[PDB]
Structure formats: C-alpha cells, structure tokens
Structure 1
Amino acid sequence: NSIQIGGLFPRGADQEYSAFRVGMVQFSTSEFRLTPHIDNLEVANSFAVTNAFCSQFSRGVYAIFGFYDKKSVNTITSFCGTLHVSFITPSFPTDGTHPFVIQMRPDLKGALLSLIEYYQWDKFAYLYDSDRGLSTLQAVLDSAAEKKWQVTAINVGNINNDKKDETYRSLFQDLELKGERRVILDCERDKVNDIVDQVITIGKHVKGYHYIIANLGFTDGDLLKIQFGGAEVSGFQIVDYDDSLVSKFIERWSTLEEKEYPGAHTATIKYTSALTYDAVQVMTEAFRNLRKQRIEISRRGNAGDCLANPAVPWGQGVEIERALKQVQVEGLSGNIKFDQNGKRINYTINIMELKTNGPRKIGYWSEVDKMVVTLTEEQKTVVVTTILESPYVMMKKNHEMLEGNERYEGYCVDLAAEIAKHCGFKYKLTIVGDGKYGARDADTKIWDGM
C-alpha cells in the first residue's frame, strides 16, 4: 500500500518540510504509508514549477502537496485542472472557482472587514503588495464603496529595496498630512517587518496610531519591537496554543532535535508549517476513507508525458479529489472542512490584540457569526497661562528676589490659588509668549494667545 505523493518545497522553507516530516511520522499507519518525492524549486518561476509538476506527473503521483506564488499559481491551477491531479497548498487562497486544488489556508477577508467594522473605522490607510494577489484589495475597495469608507490604497511592493529610504518617510509624511492614524498592513511578513522598522525609525509607533496586521501569523513574528511603543496593534491567529492538541504537539515539537528537523526547536510554529502538518493529516484521512469505501485508485500504467497532445486525464483523479474534499478533521488550524471548490469552511480565526504585557485574544471570527468577543477587561503640575493686566496679574516690587508663582500678585493670582486649592492640584503660573488673550489670524488661520 505504497502511496506516491509528490511535493514541492521552495528553497529556504525548512520548518514547513520539518512539520511535513513530523506529519509523516505522526499520521503514519500500518495500513498504508505515504511515499513522498520532494522537489525543491524557485516558486516564483513558472518554468520551474511546470518542470517540477510534469516531473511529479511522469512519476505517477496520486497527489501533490506544494506552494505557489502570484506568478506560478495559474500554472498550477491550469495544469492540475487539465490532468486531474489533486494539489494541496498552504499558500494563499485563489479567488475564483478552481477545481483539483485544496487550499489549506482560510479566507481572511471576512475577519478583516468585520474587524474594521468592530473598531468603527470610517477612514484608514491600506498598505499592500502584489504577492498573494489583489483579491483582498478588491474586497476592501468594494466594501469601502458600499459602506461609504474613505480608504487610501498604497502599493508598497513596487518600491525597490535598494532605493527605499526616503520613500517611506515621504509615504508616512503624506499619511500624517491628512491626520490619518489608522493603518492596515497586508504584506508578506518580511515586508511587514521592514515597514515596522521604518515606523519605529520615524517614530510613528507612538500613541494615536492603530495598526492592523492581516495574516494568520500575528504571533509568529516578533511583536516585541512595537510592543512598548504605545501604539495599538491588532491581528489574526489561526493557531490556538491553549488547545490540548496544539499543546501536546508543541511539547513534542520542542523536544525534537534541531539537527534532524531544521528550525523545529521552538515555542511556536509558523502557521504555514502548521497548515502543512494539517495537510498531511488531510491526505492520510482522505486515502484512508478511500480504502474504507473499498475503491481502488491504483495506477495501471505510467502516466506518460503531461505535455503530450491531446492531454488525457486519468479517471481515478476525480475520485481522489472527491476523497480529499469530503475530509473533515481536527487540527492545529481548528476544524478542517472543505466545500465543493476546495476552499476552507467553518474555520475559526482568533482575533488578537497586542497589549503592554503581551498579546491576548480579544475574540474570534466565524464564517457565520462574524466577530464574537471573548472576556471583557500620579498628579502632574498644571500649567496656568495668564497675561499681565492690572489688577489681575502684576509683578511684585521685590519680584527679582522671588521665584515662581511668588513673582506674581493680583486678583487672578489669588483666584488661581483658590481654584487650585479647591481642585487639589499643584499649579505653575506662566505668562503667554505672544502676550495676547486669544484670536484667529485671518491669514494663517492659527489661534494665538492664551
């Protein structure tokens, strides 16, 4: 019962492959054993993806687990669609109806928009790059048109890293101009980190700013940077470490040796790697359900050339597809179920906020219920501005020998003493710089005086 399944790991993805191997070990059974063929490639390269896919196909794999990019995703969807080979990926969900593709990553759109409605944001800034596609952008723009939102859409992906210094300073300068504080970051974690560093550098992480990170990896990255900055930060978490399953998994994960499994010694795990693990579970349960339904998907002969025209798909493929889509399992991402098209259903996205002490879950988002909230949660010297007028405020004859509020005498001085006495504060009498009461300049439109 050797089940050949191809796989595609982008060079530099280790913990994903580590969690893949861990999944291979944990979900292994005496009944059947998956026999992975791993192929490392450049994920952004369409040619490379094509070669790898046809390579896996000629090997006669029953399923393929892999990743794609905005560049390569159409190659995968089209080829998997033509040859009837099932493709399972942690990578961003495709917008449209794509057959023979099982997308492990849940759709973040609803959670994000409901989050925006939750914080009551009328106007904000949206920073995006073209990596995972512009689908979310289209979403928030259409919802902005519907709900009367004023949104600033800015592409940070087209700015070159070599020349980007003053570009972001000018960016947040233009953004500070309108007084817009609220900002949403939809980006790859690297770009996010970069933007964050630019923010702390320019000191935009101070109080009054609110950042919303759109991804499932909110606790996967380093939050210690802006943690003490004093600005509110909110985000999304697909992995709950409070769950017993995740807790035990994490114990075994932390006991693992780093030498054998790269980057596997950690307190946490990237959501992509977790999604990979859960994907292994899904495949195992799928083929298990295939064997329980007494359906033999075994290949009679070699697949031949994938490119050979006209392409002919194998029948079994459809059966394997249905097998995968009907799978419902429990995993690190929560309840795992799919619809007819292969998108995720009934997921729970934990809504989390970064506080002083650390991150905390303020609620959860459901496909039906939308946002639901979880458990609800010296003296400074008063500066007194005043002007010299008799007998309201006057300088004492000996005033050069005195200091502070003892310098001034008058009706308003005594009245100040009384007000401060009744209100119980320490007060500092100061004379206004321009020496005016108050006015609006007809030119500068600036209020001058006390």
Structure 2
Amino acid sequence: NSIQIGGLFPRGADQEYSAFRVGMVQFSTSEFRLTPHIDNLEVANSFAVTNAFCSQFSRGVYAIFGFYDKKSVNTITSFCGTLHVSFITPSFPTDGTHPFVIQMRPDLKGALLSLIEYYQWDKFAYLYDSDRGLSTLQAVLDSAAEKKWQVTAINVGNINNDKKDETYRSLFQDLELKKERRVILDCERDKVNDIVDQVITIGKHVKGYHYIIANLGFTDGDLLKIQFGGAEVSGFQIVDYDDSLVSKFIERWSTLEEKEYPGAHTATIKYTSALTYDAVQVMTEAFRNLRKQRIEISRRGNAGDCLANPAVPWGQGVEIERALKQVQVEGLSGNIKFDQNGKRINYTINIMELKTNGPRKIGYWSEVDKMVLTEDDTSGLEQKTVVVTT
C-alpha cells in the first residue's frame, strides 16, 4: 500500500532527511511503501507551516513528520489535535498533553535535576536558549526553592548574531562578578559551540570550572577543543555508540556518500538524525500493525480544506494515534515506549562526561529507575582515591 505520510522538514536539516531516507530504505517493507509529501519549508513562520500542513491535509496523509519551532508548537498542537491527524517529531515535548502529538525526545529534566543533586550544588549559572521553550527553566527554578539553590538564570537567545562576541564579554565578566565555576548550558549544538568558543575566548575553561551541556547531543559538540583545557564537562548523550545496533548503523551510516546524503559519511551523527531513523521504525511498526489489525483507512482528499467550518475529520485516526502509542520497539535511543499522550517512556538516558581520554559514561538514568552509577575503571587520570588505613 502506498501510504501517504508527511514530509515537512526545516531547511538545513538534510542530515536528518538523509537518515529519513535510510529509514525509507531499511523500513520499507513489501506490505506497504510509504509515500512522503516532502515539504522542505520554513519552521518559524506558521504561514509556511500551515500551507505545507493543509496541502498534506488535502492529500489525506496518515502520519506527518517534521520538527516544530516554539512558534509552531501551538500551530501543530492546535490543528493536529483538532483535525485528527497524528504528528511525529524529534522536537522537544509539549507541557500540555495534546492529542495526535507523537514526539521522539525523552524528558531530560529528570536526569538533569538528579545530576545537580549528584554534584551537590547550591549556586550555579544557567545560560539557556529559549527556543526549546522555558520548561527546563521552570524545572530548575521549582527545584531552586525546593533544594535551596541559587540559580543564575540568564537568557542568551536574545543576543543577536551581529555582536555576539562583545555581549559575551559583557556577560562572562558579569558572570565573574559572582565567579560561577558551575555553568549549565541549554542550547543547540551550534549555539552551544558558539558559547563554548566564547569561554575559550575569555580562556576561563581551566580546572575549577564545571560545565554541563543540556541536550542529547553531548558528543555532537566541540569536545576536542576543551578536552585538555582543564575544566570538567558533564552531559547527556542518548546515542550510545558502544551498542552494536548503533555501531552497525554507523557502519551503514559512515559508509554513505557524503555528496548524495549530506553529513552522512562522518562517523558521528546528530541525535535528531538518530531519532529520525528511530521514528521510521515506529511508523513502520504502526502500519504493520494496521496491516495486522486490518483496519482499512483508505482515504482520498476527503479531509481536504482545513478551513472547513467546522472541519469534522475521519475518526479512524484516533486508533492510528493509539496504534502509534502501542508500538514498543528498540532502536538507536533504547526502548521506545509511549504513554497515552505521545511522550516517550521506558527509556534510559546515558550520563556522559568529557574526560581527558574523551567522553565517558558514569551512569544511566531511566524514568523510574533513576540515576544509577555505571562502573568507574579510572585507568586514565590514574589517581584512584588512595585508601588511608588507620
């Protein structure tokens, strides 16, 4: 069955579109081959979102895929919850449990607030990009008054790209008014490496400082440039490269053509590209189960206009929303189980620390199985806490 699906992608996300096509190679079964209505359009303008949405709504597609901005978070959660078409994304989760919203990003603030309790902090700087919402800022402030913490929370997304070198010297010297050796950065890997280079600009990456990167792309940053700088960097990488299921994917990923699939031939991979390939495994297992349940959903453009007043949709997508949430598969991001709202459950986030030898796991965090430390053979930096008997 040529199953019409969505093909929205923000422009510049072609490595995620590359791993999207790898899922279209690997997970295109003989029972059905998926039909993407590819819309490589913008993500900030909801007008650009809506025209790509209502065209595929005129197609009668069954599962729309893409990202969304913090502007387009309330475009997707409004229309898809109303027009009864499920949406799949690797973007950040919504605080409101919206219908027909499936999302590939597991919640990081549970491990993050547990990580600060592990390092036992009381006052720290929290620079953050507001583009992924402020829910992580709401998490650290509700634990600030809880655990008697003093968060130095300064937004960095307000800084324009024209003068983002002198504003940091205005910012970091104000950070050195309180002299924060405890910095938590919440930005994208481009905006992280912008601020990381501003730390290398002021040179205050020596021993004594501590840095925390607050996305799933811990290995996606610039690790080598401050591997030997002196400070301690501790983060979260969901793409566990030690796994053979991940490594054999990289053995297929890093051997791809870089000219054909941009950003593929490199052995490293963005987690958003990994969650894209994991999303195709969930979408295939859905329509395999729709082939197992034999619920025939043969829709032409009967949905059609999204400006119908009122636009009452076909109600068989509610079970398609359910059958997505019934999919329990593994993948590049561990076990992929869903709640009744599209939020990922039964996952495990790997706590990763940049050391002298590179990135290193010290523990793992599941949602109910909280931060349990993972074995610490400290061969590199051989200090091993000299036991003084008495």
Aligning the two structures, in what range does the TM-score lie when normalised by the shorter sequence? Answer: over 0.9
Alpha-carbon distance in 1 for matches of 2:280, 2:388: 68
C-alpha distance 158-331 of structure 1, shift in aligned 2 (>3 A): same
Q: Is the 8 A contact 1:131 1:188 kept in 2?
A: no
Alpha-carbon distance in 1 for matches of 2:90, 2:133: 15
Q: Is the 8 A contact 2:88 2:101 kept in 1?
A: yes
Residue 304 of structure 1 deviates from its aligned partner by: 2.0
Which is bigger in relative contact order (C-alpha 8 A, separation at least 6)? 2
C-alpha distance 381-127 of structure 1, shift in aligned 2 (>3 A): closer
Paired-residue identity, %:
99
C-alpha distance 323-384 of structure 1, shift in aligned 2 (>3 A): closer
Superposed CA deviations along residues 377-414 of structure 1, whole A, max 9, x for unmatched, are x999999999xxxxxxxxxxxxxxxxxxxxxxxxxxxx
Superposed CA deviations along residues 241-272 of structure 1, whole A, max 9, x for unmatched, are 11111111110112222222222111121000
C-alpha distance 314-145 of structure 1, shift in aligned 2 (>3 A): same
C-alpha distance 300-51 of structure 1, shift in aligned 2 (>3 A): closer
Alpha-carbon distance in 2 for matches of 1:203, 1:260: 39
C-alpha distance 372-384 of structure 1, shift in aligned 2 (>3 A): closer
Q: Is the 8 A contact 2:189 2:220 kept in 1?
A: no
C-alpha distance 142-19 of structure 1, shift in aligned 2 (>3 A): same
SS of structure 2 residue aligned to 1:131: helix
Residue 188 of structure 1 deviates from its aligned partner by: 1.6
Alpha-carbon distance in 2 for matches of 1:249, 1:104: 18
**Structure 2 regions of 5+ residues with no counterpart?**
375-381
Superposed CA deviations along residues 335-355 of structure 1, whole A, max 9, x for unmatched, are 001000110101111001111
Alpha-carbon distance in 1 for matches of 2:315, 2:385: 81
Superposed CA deviations along residues 60-89 of structure 1, whole A, max 9, x for unmatched, are 111101110001111011010110000000
Alpha-carbon distance in 2 for matches of 1:46, 1:91: 16
Residue 301 of structure 1 deviates from its aligned partner by: 5.4
Partner of 1:383: 387
Alpha-carbon distance in 1 for matches of 2:229, 2:2: 54
Partner of 2:140: 140
C-alpha distance 385-308 of structure 1, shift in aligned 2 (>3 A): closer
Alpha-carbon distance in 1 for matches of 2:385, 2:315: 81
Alpha-carbon distance in 2 for matches of 1:301, 1:382: 72
Q: Is the 8 A contact 1:122 1:150 kept in 2?
A: yes
SS of structure 1 residue aligned to 2:138: helix
C-alpha distance 382-144 of structure 1, shift in aligned 2 (>3 A): closer
C-alpha distance 292-381 of structure 1, shift in aligned 2 (>3 A): closer
Mean alpha-carbon deviation: is it higher for 340-349 or for 292-301?
Answer: 292-301
C-alpha distance 227-33 of structure 1, shift in aligned 2 (>3 A): same
Superposed CA deviations along residues 109-144 of structure 1, whole A, max 9, x for unmatched, are 101111111111111011012100000001100111
Partner of 1:53: 53
Alpha-carbon distance in 1 for matches of 2:11, 2:270: 16
Paired residues, what number?
383
Residue 164 of structure 1 deviates from its aligned partner by: 2.9
Superposed CA deviations along residues 247-306 of structure 1, whole A, max 9, x for unmatched, are 111101122222222221111210001100000110000011111112112216532211
Alpha-carbon distance in 2 for matches of 1:380, 1:23: 45
C-alpha distance 240-383 of structure 1, shift in aligned 2 (>3 A): closer
C-alpha distance 322-173 of structure 1, shift in aligned 2 (>3 A): same
Q: Is the 8 A contact 2:60 2:300 kept in 1?
A: no
Superposed CA deviations along residues 397-443 of structure 1, whole A, max 9, x for unmatched, are xxxxxxxxxxxxxxxxxxxxxxxxxxxxxxxxxxxxxxxxxxxxxxx
C-alpha distance 381-301 of structure 1, shift in aligned 2 (>3 A): closer
Alpha-carbon distance in 1 for matches of 2:206, 2:322: 52
Residue 165 of structure 1 deviates from its aligned partner by: 2.7
Q: Is the 8 A contact 2:57 2:301 kept in 1?
A: no
Residue 158 of structure 1 deviates from its aligned partner by: 0.8
After TM superposition, where is structure 1 displaced by more than 6 Å over at least 4 residues in a row? 378-386
Alpha-carbon distance in 2 for matches of 1:160, 1:35: 40
Alpha-carbon distance in 1 for matches of 2:344, 2:387: 58
SS of structure 2 residue aligned to 1:280: helix
Residue 321 of structure 1 deviates from its aligned partner by: 0.6
Question: Which has the higher Rg, Structure 1 or Structure 2?
Answer: 1
Residue 129 of structure 1 pairs with residue 129 of structure 2: yes
Give me the TM-score of the superposition, normalised by structure 2.
0.94
Cα RMSD between the aligned structures?
Answer: 4.0
Alpha-carbon distance in 2 for matches of 1:317, 1:111: 34
C-alpha distance 380-282 of structure 1, shift in aligned 2 (>3 A): closer
Mean alpha-carbon deviation: is it higher for 167-176 or for 353-362?
Answer: 167-176
Q: Is the 8 A contact 1:88 1:104 kept in 2?
A: yes
SS of structure 2 residue aligned to 1:144: coil
C-alpha distance 33-225 of structure 1, shift in aligned 2 (>3 A): same
Residue 161 of structure 1 deviates from its aligned partner by: 2.2
